[PDB]
Structures are given as C-alpha cells and as structure tokens.
Curated annotation (Swiss-Prot), chains A, B:
The active site is at D50 (nucleophile), D52 (proton donor). GMP binds at D50, D52, R200, D204, K213, T247, N248, K290. (2R)-2,3-bisphosphoglycerate binds at R142, K360, Y439. GO terms for molecular function: 5'-nucleotidase activity; ATP binding; GMP 5'-nucleotidase activity; identical protein binding; IMP 5'-nucleotidase activity; metal ion binding; nucleoside phosphotransferase activity; ubiquitin protein ligase activity. This is Cytosolic purine 5'-nucleotidase. IMP binds at D50, D52, R200, D204, K213, T247, N248, S249, K290. Broad specificity cytosolic 5'-nucleotidase that catalyzes the dephosphorylation of 6-hydroxypurine nucleoside 5'-monophosphates. In addition, possesses a phosphotransferase activity by which it can transfer a phosphate from a donor nucleoside monophosphate to an acceptor nucleoside, preferably inosine, deoxyinosine and guanosine. Has the highest activities for IMP and GMP followed by dIMP, dGMP and XMP. Could also catalyze the transfer of phosphates from pyrimidine monophosphates but with lower efficiency. Adenosine 1 binds at N152, Q435. GO terms for cellular component: cytoplasm; cytosol. The gene is NT5C2. InterPro entries: HAD-like_sf, HAD-SF_hydro_IG_5-nucl, HAD_sf, Pur_nucleotidase.
Length: 470, 470
C-alpha cells in the first residue's frame, strides 16, 4: 500500500457535503489540513495552484519506476555500462529530501542545522564513528550548493535510488578502483560529481527530450491519480474568490494532464454538465520558471492555444477571457487579479520553489501538499508505541539506555523505509520537516482536504513563546 | 533604571559558590541561562568569547549618548546643518533590531516574515491603512540588502535614534521640500539612502578615526560594566576546557578594555594574586572580521604585543604561549585547539555575525548575550497582566474586541519604549526574537549566568513536534 494508493482510495469516494459529515471527515488525520500559522480563509481572495504533484499526483511506485528505467536507458545509451540495465527501481530505499554529497558520493539525511542523521555510501549505512573521517563535525554546510544537492521533489525519487545503485555498482565492480572522490577505470577517472551531473542531465533529458511524457499520457490511468471532487472544490473556490494556475510545465503537457484530471461525465458535481478544465481558472500561466517567477521572472508571453506555440513578442495587453500566459512573474498575477500577497493562497508541493520562495520573496500565504503524508500518517499512528517509547527513554536518560535509544530509533525508522520518515530520524526532525513548519502556513496529504472546511474557516495555531516568556 | 544599571547591580555582588545558593540564584530569570536547544555542558571542550557588548558591556544611556553626540558633530563638520547640534540622545525611542528603509526613510519593526509591526517616519508612527501606500502588502523583502538595513547591534542604537531625528528635522524645516525618496534644497537633492550612508559613514568614522575610543578609555568606570566574578568564571572554564577570545576589535583597544575588566586587587577570587587578562586565554585572536571569519576569513597575522602593530608577513608557526593572533578564520581556532565545532561554545551579542554565522557555517554551539534582557525581564514580569489580557482576548476573538486588542498591544508595547520590546509587538514576535530561537542554543542577560550552573549541567529544551505529530 503506497501513499498514492491511499490517495486514490480517498479520490474514489464521492463528496458528502452534509455539514456534519464534513466535520467528522476532517477530524481524521488523512483528511485534515494541518496548521503552522493561523490563517483566516475569509481573507483569501485568490487561490493559486501548481500542477505536477499538486493537482496531478503521479502514482507510486509505477511513475518512479518509469522515470528510473528511462533514466537508466539514457545513461546506457551515452556509454554507461550494460550492468545498469539489471537495476530495478526499489521504492523501499529512497526517502525524499536527502542530500547528495558530490565530493564523497554519499546520500545524507540531515536536520535543519546540517547535522548528519543518516549517511549511506551506495547501500552501506555508515554509523557515527565512521562518518567522522569525512565529516569531522558530523555536519555539512548545506548552502555550499556546488557540493551538496538537495533532492527536494518527488521527481527526484528515481535519481535518489539510482545514485545509490551506481555508487554500489562501481564500488563492487572489479573493473573500477575506488578513490575518495570517485572511480578509476584505467586512464579514465569518474568523480562522484561528474557521475551525479550525468544522472541529473539524464533525468532532465528523459522529461524534456525523451519518451517519459509520451508514455505517461498514453496510459494516464496507470500513472495519474484522478478525483471527481477536484472540480467541486475549484468551483467552490471560484464562488468566493479567484482561481489561478501557475505551473512550470508547458502548455501542451498541461492541457493533456489537466484534461484528464477533469475527464468525468459531469462538471463540479454528478448530474452537472462537464466543462473544460480552463473554465475553472480566472488566470492560467504556464512556463512559470519558479522560483525565478517570484523575483524578476521572465518576459510575459501569450500562448497560441490552437498550436501550443508561443505567439511572437511580449504580450502587453489586458487579462481577457480565454487567454493563456507563459512566463512573466508573480507580479503579473497580482496586477491582473487585483491582489496583494496576503490575499493569495498558493498551493504546491515544491518546498523550495513553490513555498519557501513565494513566502520569503512575496509574503504569499502558502499551502504545502505532501503526497507521502497519506501513508506516513498510517505508519505514525500504527507505530505510535515505538515513538512513545523513544520519548520516554529520552526523558529517563535526562549505558544500556543509550543503546536502547539507538535500537528503538532504528526500528521506528525502518517502518518507513531504508531512509526513514520524510520528517524525522527517531527524535530528530529533518531539514524538510523544519522547512515545512517555517514556510508552509498550511499543509496536508492533498489540497482536496480544503473541501472539508467551510468558506470562512479560521485555521488556528498556538502562539509561539520564547523560553524567557514561559 | 536601565538594563546596564541592572547588570552593574548584579556585577557588584560577590559570588556565593555554595551549591544551594547557586541553584536558588539561577532560578531567578535575571540569573538564568535560557535554552532553545538542549546542550550537554560536559561535551563542551572550548569556550570562545566576543569582547564588545559580551565581555565589555557599555553603560546605558551614557555610551549611546557619547556615540550620538560624536556622530552628530562629525555630520555637522562635513556640512550637515547646525540644528543637528540641538539634538540630544533619547533612550526611550530606539529599540534594537529595527530596519531602516533607505527608499522611503522609515524605521520598521518587522516579524520573521517581513510583516510590518511598526512603521515610523521620523517620530510619526504610521498606522496600518496609511502604511499600505508605501507597503501594499504590509511586507518587506528583508534580504533586499541594497534597500533595507537591519540595525542589529547595541552600537546601532545611537544611529537608530539619529535617523529618526534627521527625518523629523528635514521634514519640518521649511528650507527643505519633502519628496517620496528624500529632500530637496534648491538645486541639491538628498535621498534618504545618501543620508543613511552619511550616518553610517559618520558612525564608522567616530569609532575608527574620531575620539570615541579615547573618550571611552579615559573614563572606563563611566562607560563600561565591570564584574569581579568574570575571572572566577573564566578560571573555572579553564579547569575543564580551553578558553579563547575571537574579537573584531584591534589589539590596542582590546588590551585597554580587557585590562580594565580584570582590574581588581585579586585574581579569580578575593585573596588570590591578580593575573593579567591574557593568562585566562589559551588563544587570543583580534581583528577577527566576523562573519567573514567563519568562511575564508583573512590571512593569519601575528601581533607584536609590545608595539600593538602586526608583524610583517603571514604567521606560519605553531600555537605558543604569549602569542597573539590577528585575522585568520574559525578553522585557525579549531586546528590550534584540536576542536570540532560542536565541542565549541561561542559566546557573543551579534545575532548575525557571532551567532547565526558560526551556527550555519560551522555547526558551533552558540550562546547569545542579550544585555537589554536584564531590564526587559523586569517589564515582562511587572506588566504580565497586560500580556495575559492580550492572550485572553486573542482566544476570545477566536468589533470592540479588535479595538481592545490594538489598545492593549499599544499599552503593553509603550512600557518598553516608543519602539516596544526587542522581542515582540503585542502577540507578534519580532525577526530578532525568531532569530534568537533558531540560532542561539543558549541565551541570557549576561554570559556570567553560566557561573551559576555546575560543570556538567544538561541544559534542556523540549522536543519540537509537527502539527500532524500532535
Ligand atoms: Mg509540483
Ligand atoms: Mg560584540
């Protein structure tokens, strides 16, 4: 049972809009919207969306497996060894938000301060004392972006696993000699950095120049979660405010995915006429180039929706019905919708490019979609006894207790996968968790959970007090 | 009663090291060390210090008034109008950590997200609706460092007030015409930015080329808090670890201040021989250039302590007794003391240059000294009924309540001064407060509060849980 299985099971259910039914449903963690900072829904005038892994959640592990297979085939085609073809995607290995250290070839799980929680070289998990050789302070400087790459999106799951496969492969293949910073093969030296760059390039290529999109769209039911409640929520949002799309995807791909997401024999609710996906949006913007979008952005262009090509020139005209924009900036949205940042709730899955950047650069309100939460919630509740035990031990310690703490931490983490929870390793929160709390005003397993709250709901979070104020 | 008066009253008291006396004393907020993240003191191998506003806390408002007077005199001497000489420093106006907006000439008090809590143009406090003309989203992008300057240190208190005085003066002097971005005086245009730059330059000049240091050192009792307990604490630290000084001040000024700080007829305790300040440090480093110090730093130089001049050349030798360093990097300290970052507790008052940067760049443990806390604690407890009222109203609201909330917020804030608490405006925390919580592992009114805790004390903070984990 993957997180997408959970999401699809919930997507299959019709909306019961009886107000008591709604209250009961949203009390379940699965259908709840979680609150980091208080947000009065009555003050939101514009609801903005990302598409991929927000509106269009790709099914797991099928979509990751497809990306993996095509990325491997691209690497082989440029001259990586044939043994790569014997790799098979394994969903139990990668957790999102890991850091690849391009100097030493390690996947790292870190906290908000760059402290090492987990270090794997290939499939070898390096324990504390051994990590000190390469990380003397068990710490990385994560903003050293030339060295460290943070694998922040669900698109990075395939390459997270592939990096580990490759390091494992070269390390154990007697054709190659392992060095500190890569592999020697006679007169050829392959650094972990140049290897990482090849993987990154092959991933981009598969999405942009390869067959991934074509294979996705030829079997959308296999690859994409679909939910009859989506037009209902969007139509309700449009009753109290404006609705926009701002996506990095191009027009042709957006049109294919979005058509599928609305492809039901009805519109907002069963019995109503179907309407085109475009009719649910006051403003549609593609090729957004987030996060650059939230600063200078790019030249505002107009899509010719008939051909899917951009019209020649900068678009200087007004917002008109049926127009589709390309590029621009977040200011385009504010100016055309008559909005200020705090009137906007932007809904996306990219913790950096969607959420942190719109928050820091523009003061937008933020809603983070975390698709894996759909299944992490199940583990969290099902294994609560292990977390509680750890919480009791930590308090008792403040030795056989220290070893017990390490053992319980391991058992708890393994319930999530080999790289543990997205949100923690034992009692230590990850960088990703800390960024969620600081930048996402609201978060949930799905944006659909907004449907279960009334129009002027006040999302509440307790005030933060300093230690001396307590 | 200023915060320095509180600090000096406590400094005047002898240390009672009876273990029960110690426990009782540190329970008082004034003498407490506050904990943002748990820290096991037994793991600290090196204790590092800043000097100014850390070891050498300057007396308030006398020191600010001296800086102000000399800065004004410097501005007049370069051609600012004579009316500046009628300004007098007023401690009730500035709060630390305000943001000067160089485009519009406003002092801003903001939260961690750039939201406006207070906006003053001169001594005119602009209320919410009027701030929207210049700040349509009541928000600034604070990392736009070309536009916004954060007045982060106690050295910036004089210029905080002076900026307000100047804006007030030009606005109300009929020789000048007020524009959006500065003042016209016939064929001369003075932007708020060029005005701000003149103030900033005059402040630097007074410290570097003017008479401020000379006037400080000629009357150290008037200007500097002195405490017989300082050598006691340092000598205890030296029993369990290494002690270093890393300061931006130069050798001659450091030597004058430090001599005064140790100038008692005894050493660590009454009855013991006096020892030179240098003997309390395993490593002494001046001209540190923090925060650059915590990255590449500068060339490591050796001070000729006889002349106060640098020896010619890069110092390539070992740590030797009596040597004094200049420049270098934080790696100099780790390499010479045999330390890793998490073995180091660095003690300073500069939230950015001392604390945030050593934490983010190096993974050092951090202790933030907040001298104003000495008096903010008194107001916090004395006016607790106003904060409690506000907390009850906020909860009741979740109208005459909204107006009551604004009135109580104002009354509470005014108890601290015209720009309110360093830590909040009503129920909203400032940027400074949020940075304290995120980057300072420990904080206190004075570093001396460490004396009241035993050698292997475990400072405890509760674990943070995400909303879905609660
Ligand atoms: Mg996305
Ligand atoms: Mg200082």
């Amino acid at each position: 049972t993957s997180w997408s299985d959970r999401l699809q099971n919930a997507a299959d259910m019709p909306a019961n809009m009886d107000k008591h039914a709604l209250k009961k449903y949203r009390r379940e963690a699965y259908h709840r919207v979680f609150v980091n900072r208080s947000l009065a829904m009555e003050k939101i005038k514009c609801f903005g969306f990302d598409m991929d892994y927000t509106l269009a959640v790709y099914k797991s592990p099928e979509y990751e497996s497809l990306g993996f297979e095509l990325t491997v085939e691209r690497l082989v085609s440029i001259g990586y060894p044939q043994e790569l073809l014997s790799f098979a995607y394994d969903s139990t290995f990668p957790t999102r938000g890991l850091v690849f250290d391009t100097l030493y070839g390690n996947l790292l799980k870190v906290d908000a301060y760059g402290n090492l929680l987990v270090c794997a070289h290939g499939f070898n998990f390096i324990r504390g004392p051994e990590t000190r050789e390469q990380y003397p302070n068990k710490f990385i400087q994560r903003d050293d972006t030339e060295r460290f790459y943070i694998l922040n999106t669900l698109f990075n799951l395939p390459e997270t696993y592939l990096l580990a496969c490759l390091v494992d492969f070269f390390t154990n293949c007697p054709r190659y000699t392992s060095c500190e910073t890569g592999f020697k093969d006679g007169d050829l030296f392959m650094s972990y950095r140049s290897m990482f760059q090849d993987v990154r390039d092959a991933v981009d290529w598969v999405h942009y120049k390869g067959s991934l999109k074509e294979k996705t769209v030829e079997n959308l039911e296999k690859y994409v979660v679909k939910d009859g409640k989506l037009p209902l929520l969007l139509s309700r949002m449009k009753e109290v405010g404006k609705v926009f799309l701002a996506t990095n995807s191009d027009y042709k791909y957006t049109d294919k995915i979005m058509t599928y997401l609305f492809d039901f024999p009805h519109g907002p609710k069963p019995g109503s006429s179907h309407r085109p996906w475009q009719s649910y949006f006051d403003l549609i913007l593609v090729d957004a180039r987030k996060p650059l979008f939230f600063g200078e952005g790019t030249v505002l262009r107009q899509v010719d929706t008939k051909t899917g090509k951009l019209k020649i020139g900068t678009y200087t005209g007004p917002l008109q019905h049926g127009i589709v924009y390309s590029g621009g900036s977040s200011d385009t949205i504010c100016d055309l919708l008559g909005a200020k940042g705090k009137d906007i709730l932007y809904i996306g899955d990219h913790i950096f490019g969607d959420i942190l950047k719109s928050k820091k650069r523009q003061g937008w309100r933020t809603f983070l979609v975390i698709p894996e939460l759909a299944q992490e919630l199940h583990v969290w509740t099902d294994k609560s006894s292990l977390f509680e035990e750890l919480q009791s031990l930590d308090i008792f310690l403040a030795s056989s207790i220290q070893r017990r703490i390490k053992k319980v931490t391991h058992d708890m983490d393994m319930c999530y996968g080999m790289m543990g929870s997205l949100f923690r390793s034992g009692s230590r929160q990850t960088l990703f968790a800390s960024q969620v709390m600081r930048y996402a005003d609201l978060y949930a397993a799905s944006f659909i959970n907004l449907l279960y709250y009334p129009f002027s709901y006040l999302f509440r979070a307790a005030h933060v007090l300093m230690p001396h104020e307590s």
